[PDB]
Design a protein around this ligand. Sequence first.
Ligand code: NA
Length: 305
Amino acid sequence: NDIILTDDKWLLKNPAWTKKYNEIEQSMPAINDLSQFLKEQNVEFYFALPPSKTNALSFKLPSHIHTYAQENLNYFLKKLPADVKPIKLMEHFKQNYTNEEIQDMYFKTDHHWNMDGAFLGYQYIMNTIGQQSSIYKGKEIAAADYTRTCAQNKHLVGSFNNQLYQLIDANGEKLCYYTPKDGFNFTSVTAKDVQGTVHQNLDEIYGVEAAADTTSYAGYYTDDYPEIVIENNNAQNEVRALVLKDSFANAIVPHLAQSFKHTSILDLRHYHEKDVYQYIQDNNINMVLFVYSDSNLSGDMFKFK
Ligand code: NA
């Protein structure tokens, strides 16, 4: 049972009205377990935390009411086993940018970060992994190796559960892509959707409705798939990554996949064929990377067994 806030026509989904320490406690054992298993199997374990829009833009909420996005996140980060390496995106963002600048990294009418936010996120994620990892060597992520292209007056349709929100606002907004100078050249791209249909090639899942004047985040970037598998033989490493994600990862699924030789991308809301432990063993995963919004700290996507 969600709640939506509107204000100067920005849309804010499920602000942190309450502490969720109790919900975090109840889900943390699954992580403790996974963490111990992965440490045994010599598999690196990163937990990237894109800033939820209601954290990054909590300054737009009524000033007479305190919200707890940062407390909840801090609680999660303190209860995390020390062998989980968190990537603290809100902290990085708030350290380098003002509130008004950070607002330019989110869509106004949809509750995800935009491509500029997601890219900066990608950059910090890979930079951190690069400093921590024994198996990941790669070129530092510079904006100069990508070409950024943008359309100016697109209209994002808010989508969450079975709900579509649309804002009549003649301006609309920025829709950007960051594309490698020589394109994404993946050896293969395979994605099973929720109906069981298998799609091949990046073009059938990423930016499929880019030309649309009005559509959802999912249409502009990707939908949520049970499983995407990407083989990248041109990668200068042997990393076989497993990305476990919520929809914040969609905009940067191919940018992440470019870093590693193999990338498996699961959404546990939809992937039910194997559990995570078995998937990791069946596919010789030597690196795990969560990409969960920092408000997605507990609940259904933390069921790994
Ligand atoms: Na600053």
